[PDB]
């Protein structure tokens, strides 16, 4: 009898429960995009999670797309992240860093020397993007040269090496939500005509090469990957999600990863008139630990574990508002209500001041 409170063996890590804190961008980094003591308090308050996945963290300056997100490319950033991992470890928790590059979802104002965002193909996102001077129209990203792809892979390798020096327990590759890797994955954002575009094995190549590089730094059982097969976020869609994502699920087995993490889009059924990509399709193809996410509750999480449909269940929104989410779920306590106005930016309010039971 397994449920949301069963322990789990994730490589050498002993998880006390199956509850994961999903990665959550909070945009509360200081000068130089460096984490600080407030961030350490925030993660320390949530250390009862089976596993924390820290917010998306850019691996290189050009990988930033929103003001005040932390990076993992500089020594000052490693030192600030050390404050966080030290606090989490003091509180008996475990934490992985989510490794980010936004690709086209950025603006020159956020880029070194005011340069263009990079991407697989020169396709401007629609609408406006937040800068330090409010919202401005997106521009068109520069399509990377074939010869530049190794430099991208190397930025991820260095980001993963920095995470290791910062004292994380592992890393998660952000291959979801329409950011750089996802932009290569999906045919809606990738119309390249080299070995990184066209056929599925080409579109998956960047993910696979990034994963290979990162497993040269970390033991593979401390490296996860996140996918979001049916998001439409950031204008990133694939025309054959079942085949695309079913292929990636199988291709990742080579690496003996920590886990595959699926964000199941909350609006996919209502948009698509049904389910184009049941998570079972991926559960059956990826042979290791599966984390599922999107709108879970105590009862929904228990069910998926009991049914063997997933091993771990990640909660995003509820972990914003309930630092002791595991205990509250365990005893069927009232949950605090999440306050969207304070999700992004600011300080303690709506960040470290949600109460414990
Ligand atoms: C404020 C906020 C920030 C998020 N930031 C990230 C992020 O940094 N990386 C990521 O992969 N997903 C991110 N997401 C998506 C969440 O991790 C999660 O997949 C989503 O909220 C659905 O799960 P939930 O219903 O438990 O909240 C974010 C969502 C929210 C609400
Ligand atoms: Cl995200």
Numbering used by the authors: 14 to 370
What did the published study say regarding this structure?
To generalize this engineering approach for crystal contacts, a non-ADH-homologous enzyme was selected to apply the established strategies to the Nostoc sp. As OYEs are strongly dependent on cost-intensive NADPH as a cofactor, Mähler et al. engineered NADH-accepting variants (NostocER1) by exchanging NostocER loop regions at cofactor-binding sites to ER loop regions from Achromobacter sp.
The crystal contact at position D352K is not conform to expectations and is quite complex, with more than one amino acid residue interacting with D352K within approx. 10 Å. The neighboring NspER1-L1,5 mutants Q350K, D352K, and T354K led to an interaction with intermolecular E25/27 and an increase in crystallizability (Section 3.2, Section 3.3 and Section 3.4), with the strongest impact for T354K.
